[PDB]
Amino acid sequence: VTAITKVEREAVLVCELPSFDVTDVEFDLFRARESTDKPLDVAAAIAYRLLLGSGLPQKFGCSDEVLLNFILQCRKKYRNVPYHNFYHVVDVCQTIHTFLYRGNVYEKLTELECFVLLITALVHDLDHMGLNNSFYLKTESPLGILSSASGNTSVLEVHHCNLAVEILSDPESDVFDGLEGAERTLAFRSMIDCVLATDMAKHGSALEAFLASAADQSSDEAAFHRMTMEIILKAGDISNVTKPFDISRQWAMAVTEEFYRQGDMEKERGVEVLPMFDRSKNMELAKGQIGFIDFVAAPFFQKIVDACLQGMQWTVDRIKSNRAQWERVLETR
């Protein structure tokens, strides 16, 4: 991979983010992106500020310049798609920062694990093309064939890990270059385990494992830590419904458009198009959000908060408030 330039770094470093608190649970990334005509630079500056503010990179021998180079190498591998773009991963990083520090989940993890989770957020969807794992398998695309042949159906998640490893193989963008031995190994393994756990086909089993470990006072400590990391990255990845309504709605619009684009390509290839991906089904945004709330997000957040993560109660409260607001949209239609 080609080295990040001085000029690229400077375009991020000029962004001052006046009037934003990147640590706040009501921080608004959409407003941040509308605040200037260089939203990719503002997004990178948000990630840079979150990581320096944690005080963690400093502790692990990662210089300011190596951090910024890493952020920019991640940025170059995100595509111009409606949802799974650079803004999604910065949002996940910011959201995880709030879970760790506003929700006090940092108390369950080492400082290194906190640092790994914040970094992992930025790599977890590298080179996403706006198509899900199912698309690659149904169309027998080359990447799908490779996944089936090699025995792992998490087509995208393995791909994301490959590209993360590539970025980290150059010292100038290796945020773990200050580590060695077991610490270095833990950093890479925990990052990869977390990325692999973001495949939604593994949602129920990842949640059940975490819950069983949290309930067991004799759970293996290293295993509990690892599952806690996995669960936090998953939480960030389905956190759009835990945000103030207008932010939540803007994420819902972006993800719907990305799904519809997949369905349009699936039609053209003559493969199965699920209702959720079909433009001509006209499905209402409100009903889709209520369904995602009721069947995925509300139970996930309630269960993890009740099991262990009491400081994250606000997520459950905001989901409830958003559900009531979508119900008002239906009531008044």
Encoded one letter per residue, x for contact with ligand 6M5 by CB under 6 A and - for no contact, window 227-246 reads ----------xx-x------
- Residue found under tokens 């027998």: 140
Kindly state the smallest distance separating residue 291's Cβ from ligand 6M5, in Å: 3
Give the single-character DSSP code of 297: I
Residues in binding site for AMP: 84-88, 125, 237, 289
CA distance 196 to 144: 16
Structural tokens at position 26: 């009501």
Question: Does residue number 266 form part of the binding site for ligand 6M5 (CB under 6 A)?
Answer: no
- Within residues 242-301, the interface with Mg ion by CB under 5 A covers none
CA–CA gap between residue 98 and residue 215 (Å, rounded): 24
CB of 276 to ligand 6M5, least distance (A): 5
Residue 58: HSE in the Cβ half-sphere, 13 Å Cα cutoff: 9
Helical (H) or strand (E) element with 286: helix 285-292
> Identity (one letter) of the amino acid at 32?
A
- Nearest distance in Å: CB 198, ligand 6M5: 6
Q: Which of 251, 260, 301, 326 binds ligand 6M5 (CB under 6 A)?
A: 251
d(CA 79, CA 333): 36
Residue 165 parent element (H or E): helix 155-168
Torsion, CA 227, CA 231, CA 233, CA 236, rounded to 10: -170
Which entry of Zn ion, Mg ion, ligand 6M5, none binds 176, CB below 5 to 8 A by partner kind? none
Position of minimal CB gap to ligand 6M5: 291
Q: What are the residue numbers of the active site?
A: 84
Given 276, 278, 303, 307, the residue binding ligand 6M5 (CB under 6 A)? 276
List interacting residues with Mg ion (CB under 5 A). Answer: 125, 198
Interaction site with ligand 6M5 (CB under 6 A) = 200, 237-238, 240, 251-252, 255, 276, 288, 291-292, 295-296
